[PDB]
Amino acid sequence: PYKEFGATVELLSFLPSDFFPSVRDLLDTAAALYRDALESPEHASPHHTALRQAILCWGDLMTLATWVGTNLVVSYVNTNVGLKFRQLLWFHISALTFGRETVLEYLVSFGVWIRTPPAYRPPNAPILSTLPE
């Protein structure tokens, strides 16, 4: 579900929950990315098109989520637990702006940092810094 781009579930599933924006924020960023490249100067990327795998499929997903709650009837537990999209929409957006190289090496760094015991590791996890000057 990631592999064709070089990572696995592990590498994304280390990052803490608050490392990611909200689903709606990430849909804003993505909908603005497909607006400026695969829109006019087509030649898109694998990450451009996979972004629509998340955008569209999510639409079809909160599609189900919203017609629930019209059935509080009993157990209405909806899954806004899919942040699999929060990560996903991040993984293609960052790898689009920072490059696939930078994102893969960043989440390798973070994986190392998180399974280093909280003795021999730096105080704060490595930060994925934006494109330099």
């Epitope: 990052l15 803490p16 929950s17 608050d18 490392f19 990611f20 924006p21 909200s22 689903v23 709606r24 924020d25 804003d28 806004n80 929060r86 991040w90 960052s94 920072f98 973070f110 704060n124 996890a125 490595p126 930060i127 994925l128 810094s129 934006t130």
Partner: single-chain antibody, 229 residues
Framework: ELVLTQTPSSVSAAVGGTVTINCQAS??????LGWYQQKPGQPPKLLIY???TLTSVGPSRFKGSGSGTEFTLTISGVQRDDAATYYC??????????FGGGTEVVVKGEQLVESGGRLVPPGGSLTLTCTVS????????ISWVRQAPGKGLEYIGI?????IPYYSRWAKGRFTISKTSTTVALKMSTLTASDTATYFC?????????????????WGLGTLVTISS
């Protein structure tokens, strides 16, 4: 797009009396509101977040209420301490986020260093550095807020741990947020005299769903950008 209209514009109350504050939104923003106290010349302070939940120091005489559109702050009985200008900062997305106009209560009876603020000509550029300490820039957000002299608070932007910036619709295409290992820098283009103000950065804390733009604490001291020819 979200505008938060805050009434009554000013309250003059007395000791032991009650002060009541109102915030009406442009959309249902759910519980994504926060209530902030700014005393004069200081930086703002976080009092309530999530429409209800009270923060660390806030005394139980302070209480918020409401969700969706109608939001209401109430100081049950008011001391000299509580006299300040009070804001509601709501966030629809981390893009559409705004403070109310401010309402000044008149009563009768881990750290961040901003830098770079200076005197810049119109149409020039500028770069602010928010030097963040004691905070994990991979787990926490750094937001940029500004206030003109004697004016209200205006949300500029935010940057998450995932290094994805977000800007307000008024700002977009001028202000860009960047991040290094130890700092969060705000680049400002074609500066017009409308922007002479005090720029603060504050750490946003994300909820379970990753909205950091309504909960800003701690706060920097701010820095003054003066635009004159």
């Amino acid at each position: 797009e979200l505008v938060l209209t805050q009434t009554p514009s000013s309250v003059s109350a007395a000791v032991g009396g009650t002060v009541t504050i109102n915030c009406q939104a442009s959309q249902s923003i759910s519980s994504r509101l926060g209530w902030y106290q700014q005393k004069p010349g200081q930086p703002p302070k976080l009092l309530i977040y999530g429409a209800s939940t009270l923060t660390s120091v806030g005394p139980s005489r302070f209480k918020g209420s409401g969700s969706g559109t109608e939001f209401t702050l109430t100081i049950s009985g008011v001391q000299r301490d509580d006299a300040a200008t009070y804001y509601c900062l709501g966030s629809d997305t981390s893009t559409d986020t705004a403070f109310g106009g401010g309402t000044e209560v008149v009563v009768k009876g881990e750290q961040l260093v901003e830098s770079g603020g200076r005197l810049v000509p119109p149409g020039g550029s500028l770069t602010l550095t928010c030097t963040v300490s004691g905070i994990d820039l991979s787990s926490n957000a750094i937001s940029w807020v500004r206030q003109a002299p004697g004016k209200g608070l205006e949300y500029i932007g935010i940057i998450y741990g995932g290094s994805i910036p977000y800007y307000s619709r008024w700002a977009k295409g001028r202000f860009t947020i960047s991040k290094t290992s130890t700092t969060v820098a705000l680049k400002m283009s074609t500066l017009t005299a409308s922007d002479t103000a005090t720029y603060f950065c504050a750490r946003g804390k994300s909820d379970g769903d990753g909205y950091a733009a309504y909960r800003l604490d701690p706060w920097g001291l701010g820095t003054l950008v003066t635009i004159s020819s």
